[PDB]
Ligand binder design. Structure first.
Ligand SMILES: [Cd+2]
Length: 37
């Protein structure tokens, strides 16, 4: 978890937001889409 960027844990993806991550983590629910992993 860097200063100018944060992780969702579930997508282990670094983002440049705060509230967008909180919301983006709550949007998590299965894959149900493409993407190899
Ligand atoms: Cd996420």
């Amino acid at each position: 978890w860097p200063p100018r960027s944060y992780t969702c844990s579930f997508c282990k993806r670094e983002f440049r937001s705060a509230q967008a991550l909180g919301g983006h983590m709550n949007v998590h629910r299965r894959d149900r889409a493409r993407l190899r992993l």
